[PDB]
Write a protein that binds this ligand. Structure first.
Ligand SMILES: [K+]
Ligand SMILES: [K+]
Ligand SMILES: [K+]
Ligand SMILES: [K+]
Ligand SMILES: [K+]
Ligand SMILES: [K+]
Ligand SMILES: [K+]
Ligand SMILES: [K+]
Ligand SMILES: [K+]
Ligand SMILES: [K+]
Ligand SMILES: [K+]
Ligand SMILES: [K+]
Ligand SMILES: [K+]
Ligand SMILES: [K+]
Ligand SMILES: [K+]
Ligand SMILES: [K+]
Ligand SMILES: [K+]
Ligand SMILES: [K+]
Ligand SMILES: [Mg+2]
Ligand SMILES: [Mg+2]
Ligand SMILES: [Mg+2]
Ligand SMILES: [Mg+2]
Ligand SMILES: [Mg+2]
Ligand SMILES: [Mg+2]
Ligand SMILES: [Mg+2]
Ligand SMILES: [Mg+2]
Ligand SMILES: [Mg+2]
Ligand SMILES: [Mg+2]
Ligand SMILES: [Mg+2]
Ligand SMILES: [Mg+2]
Ligand SMILES: [Mg+2]
Ligand SMILES: [Mg+2]
Ligand SMILES: [Mg+2]
Ligand SMILES: [Mg+2]
Ligand SMILES: [Mg+2]
Ligand SMILES: [Mg+2]
Ligand SMILES: [Mg+2]
Ligand SMILES: [Mg+2]
Ligand SMILES: [Mg+2]
Ligand SMILES: [Mg+2]
Ligand SMILES: [Mg+2]
Ligand SMILES: [Mg+2]
Ligand SMILES: [Mg+2]
Ligand SMILES: [Mg+2]
Ligand SMILES: [Mg+2]
Ligand SMILES: [Mg+2]
Ligand SMILES: [Mg+2]
Ligand SMILES: [Mg+2]
Ligand SMILES: [Mg+2]
Ligand SMILES: [Mg+2]
Ligand SMILES: [Mg+2]
Ligand SMILES: [Mg+2]
Ligand SMILES: [Mg+2]
Ligand SMILES: [Mg+2]
Ligand SMILES: [Mg+2]
Ligand SMILES: [Mg+2]
Ligand SMILES: [Mg+2]
Ligand SMILES: [Mg+2]
Ligand SMILES: [Mg+2]
Ligand SMILES: [Mg+2]
Ligand SMILES: [Mg+2]
Ligand SMILES: [Mg+2]
Ligand SMILES: [Mg+2]
Ligand SMILES: [Mg+2]
Ligand SMILES: [Mg+2]
Ligand SMILES: [Mg+2]
Ligand SMILES: [Mg+2]
Ligand SMILES: [Mg+2]
Ligand SMILES: [Mg+2]
Ligand SMILES: [Mg+2]
Ligand SMILES: [Mg+2]
Ligand SMILES: [Mg+2]
Ligand SMILES: [Mg+2]
Ligand SMILES: [Mg+2]
Ligand SMILES: [Mg+2]
Ligand SMILES: [Mg+2]
Lengths: 155, 119, 73
RNA sequence: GUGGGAGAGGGUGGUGGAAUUCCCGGAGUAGCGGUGAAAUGCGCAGAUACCGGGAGGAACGCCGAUGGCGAAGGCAGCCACCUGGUCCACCCGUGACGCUGAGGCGCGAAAGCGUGGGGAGCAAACCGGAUUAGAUACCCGGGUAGUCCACGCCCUAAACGAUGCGCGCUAGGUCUCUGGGUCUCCUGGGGGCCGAAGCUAACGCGUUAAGCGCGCCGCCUGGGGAGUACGGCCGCAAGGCUGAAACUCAAAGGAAUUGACGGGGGCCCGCACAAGCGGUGGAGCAUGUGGUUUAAUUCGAAGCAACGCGAAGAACCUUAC
């Protein structure tokens, strides 16, 4: 990425909720390019958000993704004599990429042996403000700013 | 406690730390702070942030004496001089003025090696 | 680059060797009590050299300052 | 000579404000200082930061310049006194009274020496703290001589324009300091830059010559040995001046050229880093290799660019042991 600002890939809107943000999440759940099994998993997960929540699946989803978005994150950087963990604002873009990554990550750190469940349960624990995902998000925000003494290394 | 309401705020900037001193209209200190008073103890006392906290600590402590408006006086250069100037303004205290009064000799004492060969 | 009407223009006749004319000399000092350069004084090499000698006399008499504190920053 | 001018030129006395340190008083409290990060250090016997009073030493901010003065070293707050040089105008006076200058005599940055004084800050040596593989250094905290004054020594230097002094001659352009004029501009003295002709190995120099010429002084004659030894002179000393030989080398050396290089600068690329996804390094095994073993373990490949490579087929064969 030395020559251009690398445009962002536009993803094919969802084959159901038609939302693009969903396809994104599905791609993260995916592995070994099993686009099928991936999407399936995300869908039975919306079905579980149903049989346990009178609320719309998609609504729960986008809600969680929102609480998992870090607005600040510490980025390393050298200033001669040591590396200073420098706090810094997080891009609208990176926020989403991070939120989604973390959800799948936490979801798979859960106990229930059914994939579709973990995702579902994680999406919920998130909507409320709990769960391994929101944890990282809060661990980083606090981990950043906790170094506010290096706010003058803007970058 | 003693009630002053109006006084002065001195900011001593240094490339090693910033320290603020609030005083009555005659220049007698009422309270003070610095990067060291707040947590910081190494090279962070110099930080613009440390200066901020030191500045706010100073104001609040001077609220206890019921002070409200100050006359800021700045001395020295130093990472975090301006943050203090700002930290005060936005802190209940009414900044009536800001004045730079850093001492500079009309060339008298030979500097330490570290500060020579200048100009 | 220091263009705000040189102090000489905005002024009339005056004895550059008069160390007591505070109202006139005072003009050649900056916000601080520092002697303005030539870019500001507008004076000439020879004139400016006499201004200095003059001002430094004023200062010792107390009519003029050596240094001023800057109001702002 | 007369009349004007500029200047940190020199000497003596006086004197002004800023800052640092220390002392005193106030107010005030837990740190300050310092670095890459730290520590030594200082602070509750109250430091740091702030206000007021005092003492002392040293140096003069802005003006300040690409500026000015001096033979050089060098000279910078302001005032007075004493004193040097120098430029211009007027063509007034003398009438070649001139140039250079071995030796002599004087001056001569810093450090250093002697006697006495002074001592704020800074600081060889030195005492400590860090750093490092070590660190008799670079960084940090201290600190004596010294730095300052007087008187007397020392006499060196990248004491440099690395360019001896004087005079005459040879296009201009442009900025500048200082004087005179009919004051767009002309004219004299000084400081810069670009350049005619010309010079130069080149770089460059070019009316401020490194050009063209004359006068006088100083100096050079390959490198190392060596600015040493000896002698002499000088010095309180440190040491200065003058200044070799044996031996030994095929060079030492100047300028410029093309590269290469840089813990030099600028601009710019690559899955180079960063962002990210999967993996190796751990296990079992397959395979190549090192090593070791063997009668033989055929040979080659070696960091990248050797190691599932030559081997796209080793039971005999292949096969070189
Ligand atoms: K000095
Ligand atoms: K301590
Ligand atoms: K301090
Ligand atoms: K000069
Ligand atoms: K000594
Ligand atoms: K001296
Ligand atoms: K002498
Ligand atoms: K004239
Ligand atoms: K030539
Ligand atoms: K050149
Ligand atoms: K020559
Ligand atoms: K001798
Ligand atoms: K003698
Ligand atoms: K002797
Ligand atoms: K380069
Ligand atoms: K790579
Ligand atoms: K990054
Ligand atoms: K291993
Ligand atoms: Mg510090
Ligand atoms: Mg005369
Ligand atoms: Mg003159
Ligand atoms: Mg004149
Ligand atoms: Mg003088
Ligand atoms: Mg006190
Ligand atoms: Mg202690
Ligand atoms: Mg106590
Ligand atoms: Mg005590
Ligand atoms: Mg007390
Ligand atoms: Mg103090
Ligand atoms: Mg005081
Ligand atoms: Mg004194
Ligand atoms: Mg003393
Ligand atoms: Mg001269
Ligand atoms: Mg010189
Ligand atoms: Mg004279
Ligand atoms: Mg005549
Ligand atoms: Mg005659
Ligand atoms: Mg002579
Ligand atoms: Mg001498
Ligand atoms: Mg000397
Ligand atoms: Mg000396
Ligand atoms: Mg002595
Ligand atoms: Mg002595
Ligand atoms: Mg003494
Ligand atoms: Mg010291
Ligand atoms: Mg030291
Ligand atoms: Mg002697
Ligand atoms: Mg020189
Ligand atoms: Mg001619
Ligand atoms: Mg012209
Ligand atoms: Mg002229
Ligand atoms: Mg000229
Ligand atoms: Mg000059
Ligand atoms: Mg030519
Ligand atoms: Mg030549
Ligand atoms: Mg050539
Ligand atoms: Mg030239
Ligand atoms: Mg000549
Ligand atoms: Mg000789
Ligand atoms: Mg020889
Ligand atoms: Mg010698
Ligand atoms: Mg010989
Ligand atoms: Mg010989
Ligand atoms: Mg020989
Ligand atoms: Mg060469
Ligand atoms: Mg290219
Ligand atoms: Mg590329
Ligand atoms: Mg590519
Ligand atoms: Mg990477
Ligand atoms: Mg990874
Ligand atoms: Mg393995
Ligand atoms: Mg074999
Ligand atoms: Mg073998
Ligand atoms: Mg072979
Ligand atoms: Mg082999
Ligand atoms: Mg065989």
């Amino acid at each position: 990425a030395r020559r251009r600002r690398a445009e962002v890939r536009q993803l094919q809107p969802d084959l159901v909720y038609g939302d693009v943000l969903v396809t994104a999440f599905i791609n993260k759940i995916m592995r070994d390019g099993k686009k099928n099994l991936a999407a399936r998993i995300f869908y039975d997960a919306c079905k579980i958000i149903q049989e346990k929540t009178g609320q719309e699946p998609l609504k729960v989803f986008k809600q969680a993704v929102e609480n998992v978005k870090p607005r600040m994150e510490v980025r390393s950087r050298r200033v001669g004599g040591a590396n200073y963990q420098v706090p810094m604002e997080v891009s609208p873009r990176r926020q989403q990429s991070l939120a989604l990554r973390w959800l799948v990550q936490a979801a798979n750190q859960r106990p229930e042996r059914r994939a579709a469940v973990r995702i579902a349960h994680e999406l919920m624990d998130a909507a409320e403000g709990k769960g391994g995902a929101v944890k990282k998000k809060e661990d980083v925000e606090r981990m950043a700013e906790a170094n506010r003494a290096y706010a003058h290394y803007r970058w | 406690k003693r009630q002053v309401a109006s006084g002065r705020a001195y900011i001593h900037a240094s490339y090693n730390n910033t320290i603020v001193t609030i005083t009555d209209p005659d220049g007698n200190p009422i309270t003070w702070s610095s990067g060291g008073v707040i947590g910081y103890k190494g090279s962070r006392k110099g930080t613009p942030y440390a200066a901020q906290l030191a500045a706010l600590d100073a104001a609040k402590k001077a609220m206890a004496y019921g002070m409200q408006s100050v006359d800021v006086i700045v001395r020295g250069t130093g990472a975090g001089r301006e943050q203090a100037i700002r930290a005060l303004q936005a802190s209940g205290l009414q900044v009536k003025s800001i004045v730079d009064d850093t001492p500079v000799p009309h060339n008298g004492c030979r500097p330490k090696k570290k500060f020579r060969k200048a100009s | 680059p220091s263009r705000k009407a040189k102090v000489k223009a905005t002024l009339g006749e005056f004895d550059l060797r008069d160390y007591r004319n505070v109202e006139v000399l005072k003009r050649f000092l900056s916000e601080t009590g520092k002697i303005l350069p030539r870019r500001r004084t507008g004076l000439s090499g020879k004139e400016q050299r006499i201004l200095a000698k003059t001002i430094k006399r004023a200062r010792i008499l107390g009519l003029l300052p050596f240094t001023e504190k800057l109001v702002r920053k």
